[PDB]
Design a protein around this nucleic acid. Structure first.
Ligand SMILES: Cc1ccnc2c1NC(=O)c1cccnc1N2C1CC1
Lengths: 555, 412
DNA sequence: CAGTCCCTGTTCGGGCGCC
RNA sequence: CGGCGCCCGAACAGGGACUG
């Protein structure tokens, strides 16, 4: 008989399946003789057992290596058993963001020893565990065994651990509403606004409650260690910061250097305001080999520069104060890049960040702002569970004009104006009605699918015509092309009639920037005009100068 | 100690494994206090990692209500029981419900909490209450009684319902009673005072039969259909004839007797857009024959029970929204328009949310079925706030569209 | 009535960043 | 071996327009 620590989880098996039987695959020769003994150790502690007849089960060994260890750690591979074991609802849903933590007067960390081996495996599943691995080289054929606890690299080890642990902490928590625990892996972090000694009181009284279930918590544990080091973070009860970032100054630039660079910049971007990755992100476009050679452009270096000066001085985030409003203010950084800061007391930030993402073939600043505001609301709900008040570089009239005209449903939550140039503007508007006494251009363009060849041109009410031959083009491009013509050749006010539903869709959504140089040009002309009314009619309905245009362009 | 109708996820498919979306602290609190109270009542109970299934949950306040209602998005579960409920037990849909001078919707879902649930099925009601900032892990439950918003819940409670209602239905044979999910639709042609009284009376029926019921009135006899209509004009600019002809071409996708031929010839030269062009008579007669073809009913449009309904919504500006319900393109079972809804002139997502709800409601009152929406909105926008404006106990099916407007002219 | 193209617009498998 | 953030490249849905 062994003994019985803590409530067990009913692990089942994927219906219509049974335990694995496998041949061994290579692992290094020196250290593995050690586990032959180590196995006998576990025999006495309750972590292993065996039976001869009853196990049709066998498992191999394949591993991954870790830096920074002063002693060696044994391991076993259930990968075949893994693939054969029921799925769980995973407990690690991701991690809290430091900026989301409420400020706590006292914060300690207990580290659980024998954490995984401190948890009882499901009685009946215990059977499925049996495994075998080479002695030193080998001598006699061998022997085998089963696991009585949570096995390394098994799925339920993390799920069931986390849940069991949770169950244990629950009564302590309920008897202690104002303590605050958070569990990451095998570490617990406790905190309170109580006084320093009654705090250490509850720290031991909890090591008690953990012990009563058999969870060992040593005293190398440190109140005298915070800042705590967690996932790139440095955490003090009062303030948090990213762990220190090293930016390569290397003269030799390979695309993989720029990659690691960028990753470092974004991670910096959660705290250091105003990080721009754009040109560095441009280098990465469409490269075949990760080892290729690339030079830095003046832009990418000027960015790298401004960024180096941002990283120069250090900085820290505060924590969240639920009593006070959340404030998110966004500044336009240009070239479709955006930055935002989220703070509560002015000039003290919880966090910063970028929104650089260019969405769509043709877009504009209002849209991009709307998007950033959305990204940011989401981030705010995950972290603080509420939406910030927004401070935005856009006139309430600008915005009102946009959202109220746009065909899609669109919205920004409660927000106010900040005059912090550059201000976000709409660079042109199309008229809602035809313009009297403006010349009227009927436009067309056409291309032939086979020859990829075509022409773009127009006819007007004034008698004015044009047809321009064009090479290596498409039907869409010619229709854009014709509108471009009508713009270049027209005065400050103009009505343009197009039968291209495509082109009309683009211009009508009022883009200020495009991937397409031609659209960019159309845009530039659009911005130069005083009044532009752009209309659509169906093709080959014999309409207007379009039947006339159609003949001339289609000829 | 009563029976339990076994239930099965229809063949081949597993339990819903869908992720819980982040909640606001407001709503996480309301859910926590509701589930802890519901645990105490043994309605639901805690679960482990051995249950790998999930349905999303959130909370809402019904229209003009300050009380938090829990709401589960059972759509994936509802699909695999979809076959359970649809093939096994049917609810005949009153074609008269729509003809009532009034229809009230009472929320009877609480009743479902009486009945036990098949013990083998319960692992499929699994839901996580999320935590702010991932501070705690999720609080996970599963359902002991008949879970609200699942379609099996009104299916299994069918007998009991027909029972509790039969006194009233018998005593009041002329009142029409429909049941769609957690909601019961009760309607009558009675003058409104005594209607509201008969509703109070029914509230009493379920009250003394062991039910609680946390305005709801509708007016289906007054529901109007939006016809397509060409403008009445004195003088036509070129631009007028152009917009006319193009619109006319679309409408002719719907009604085939339309001809643009003579109006097209009206557009012949290259003329200034704003020039005023007189209408030839042959075209004038073609146009008038068109306004005519546009007052009739579209050939061959009738509801087909087997097909899903589809609703399309267009944003028309200044608070107006147009919609169309159809099972096949261009054959519309209904077209309509909304204006000055809550959110008008300030929040589009709120207005659209409202719209989706009114459309779903008529869709249920009319075919006893919720439509699948094509929503004129970006995906991300919608997901974020729609969760904020929702007052309904059900959740339609939706997908997202971008349609720069040439179909917008379902309105002037 | 099929079968070709040109646009635009989310989903899924390939490297950095944080464990 | 695994999640998250991002960037990079490939496969499907909507729409347009041509081949008799
Ligand atoms: C890494 C971590 C993750 C989540 N929460 C905490 C911590 N550790 C802290 O350093 C911490 C710091 C300040 C406030 N709360 C903290 N705590 C919470 C327990 C009071």
């Amino acid at each position: 008989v062994p003994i019985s620590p803590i409530e067990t989880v009913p692990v089942k098996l994927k219906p219509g399946m049974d335990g694995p039987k496998v041949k061994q695959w290579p692992l290094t020769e020196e250290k593995i003789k050690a586990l032959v003994e180590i196995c006998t150790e576990m025999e006495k502690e309750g972590k292993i057992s065996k039976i001869g007849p009853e196990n049709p089960y066998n498992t191999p060994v394949f591993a991954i290596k870790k830096k920074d260890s002063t002693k060696w750690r044994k391991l076993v591979d259930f990968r075949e058993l893994n693939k054969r074991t029921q799925d769980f609802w995973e407990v690690q849903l991701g991690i809290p963001h430091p900026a989301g933590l409420k400020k706590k007067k006292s914060v300690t960390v207990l580290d659980v020893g024998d954490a995984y081996f401190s948890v009882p495996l499901d009685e009946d599943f215990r059977k499925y565990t049996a495994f075998t691995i080479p002695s030193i080289n080998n001598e006699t054929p061998g022997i085998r065994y089963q696991y009585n606890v949570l096995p390394q690299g098994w799925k339920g080890s993390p799920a069931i651990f986390q849940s069991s642990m949770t169950k244990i902490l629950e009564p302590f928590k309920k008897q202690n509403p104002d303590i605050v625990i958070y569990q990451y892996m095998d570490d617990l972090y406790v905190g309170s606004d109580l006084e320093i000694g009654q705090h250490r009181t509850k720290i031991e009284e909890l090591r008690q409650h953990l012990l009563r279930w058999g969870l060992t918590t040593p005293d190398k544990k440190h109140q005298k260690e915070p800042p705590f080091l967690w996932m790139g973070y440095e955490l003090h009860p009062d303030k948090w910061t990213v762990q220190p970032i090293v930016l390569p100054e290397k003269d030799s630039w390979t695309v993989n250097d720029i990659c690691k660079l960028v990753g470092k910049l974004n991670w910096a971007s959660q705290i250091y305001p105003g990080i721009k990755v754009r040109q560095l992100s441009k280098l990465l476009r469409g490269t075949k080999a990760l080892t290729e050679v690339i030079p830095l452009t003046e832009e990418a270096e000027l960015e790298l520069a401004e960024n180096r000066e941002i990283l120069k001085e250090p900085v820290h985030g505060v924590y969240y104060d639920p009593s006070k409003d959340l404030i998110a203010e966004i500044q336009k950084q240009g070239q479709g890049q955006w930055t935002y800061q989220i703070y509560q007391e002015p000039f003290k930030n919880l966090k910063t960040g970028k929104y650089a993402r260019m969405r769509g073939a043709h877009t504009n600043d209002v849209k991009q702002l709307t998007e950033a505001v959305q990204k940011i609301t989401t981030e705010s709900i995950v972290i603080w569970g509420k939406t910030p008040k927004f401070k935005l570089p856009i006139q309430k009239e600008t915005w009102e004009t946009w959202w109220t005209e746009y065909w899609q449903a669109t919205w920004i939550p409660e927000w106010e104006f900040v005059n912090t140039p550059p201000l976000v503007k709409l660079w042109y508007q199309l008229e809602k009605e035809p313009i009297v006494g403006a010349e009227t251009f009927y436009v067309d363009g056409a291309a032939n699918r086979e020859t990829k060849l075509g022409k773009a041109g127009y006819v007007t009410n004034k008698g004015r015509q044009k047809v321009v031959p064009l090479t290596n083009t498409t039907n869409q491009k010619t229709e854009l092309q014709a509108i471009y013509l009508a713009l270049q050749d027209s005065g400050l006010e103009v009505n343009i009639v197009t039968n291209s539903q495509y082109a009309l869709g683009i211009i009508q959504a009022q883009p200020d920037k495009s991937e397409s140089e031609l659209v960019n040009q159309i845009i530039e002309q659009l911005i130069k005009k005083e009044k532009v009314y752009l209309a659509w009619v169906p093709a080959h309905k014999g309409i207007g100068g379009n039947e006339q245009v159609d003949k001339l362009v289609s000829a | 100690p009563i029976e339990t109708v076994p239930v099965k996820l229809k063949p081949g498919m597993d339990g819903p494994k869908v992720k819980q979306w982040p909640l606001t602290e407001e709503k996480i609190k309301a859910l926590v206090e509701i589930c802890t109270e519901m645990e105490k009542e043994g309605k639901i109970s805690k679960i482990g990692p051995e249950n790998p299934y999930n349905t999303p949950v959130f909370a809402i306040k019904k229209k003009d209500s300050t009380k938090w209602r829990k709401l589960v998005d059972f759509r994936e579960l509802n699909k695999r029981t979809q076959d359970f409920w649809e093939v096994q037990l049917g609810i005949p849909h009153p074609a008269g419900l729509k003809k009532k001078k009034s229809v009230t919707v009472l929320d009877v879902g609480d009743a479902y909490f009486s009945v036990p649930l098949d013990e083998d099925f319960r692992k499929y009601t699994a839901f996580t209450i999320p935590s702010i900032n991932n501070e705690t892990p999720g609080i996970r439950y599963q359902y002991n009684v008949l879970p609200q918003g699942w379609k099996g819940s009104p299916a299994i409670f069918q007998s009991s319902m027909t029972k509790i209602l039969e006194p009233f239905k018998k005593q009041n044979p002329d009142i029409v009673i429909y049941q769609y999910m957690d909601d019961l639709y009760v309607g009558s042609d009675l003058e409104i005072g005594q209607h509201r009284t008969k509703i109070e009376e029914l509230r009493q029926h379920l009250l003394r039969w062991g039910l609680t019921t946390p305005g709801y009135e509708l007016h289906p006899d007054k529901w109007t259909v939006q016809p397509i209509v060409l403008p009445e004009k004195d003088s036509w600019t070129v631009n007028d004839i152009q917009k006319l002809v193009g619109k006319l071409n679309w409408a002719s996708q719907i009604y085939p007797g339309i001809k643009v031929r003579q109006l097209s010839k009206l557009l012949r030269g290259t003329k200034a857009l704003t020039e005023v062009i007189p209408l030839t008579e042959e075209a004038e007669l073609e146009l008038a024959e068109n306004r005519e073809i546009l007052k009739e009913p579209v050939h061959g449009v009738y509801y087909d029970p087997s097909k899903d309904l589809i609703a399309e919504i267009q944003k028309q500006g200044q608070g107006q929204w147009t919609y169309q319900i159809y099972q096949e393109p261009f054959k519309n079972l209904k077209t309509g328009k909304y204006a000055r809804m809550r959110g008008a002139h300030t929040n589009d997502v709120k207005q659209l949310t409202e719209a989706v709800q009114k459309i779903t409601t008529e869709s249920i009152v009319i075919w006893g079925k919720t439509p699948k929406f094509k929503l004129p909105i970006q995906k991300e926008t919608w997901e974020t706030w729609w969760t904020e404006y929702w007052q309904a106990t059900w959740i339609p099916e939706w997908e997202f569209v971008n349609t720069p407007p040439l179909v917008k002219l379902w309105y002037q």
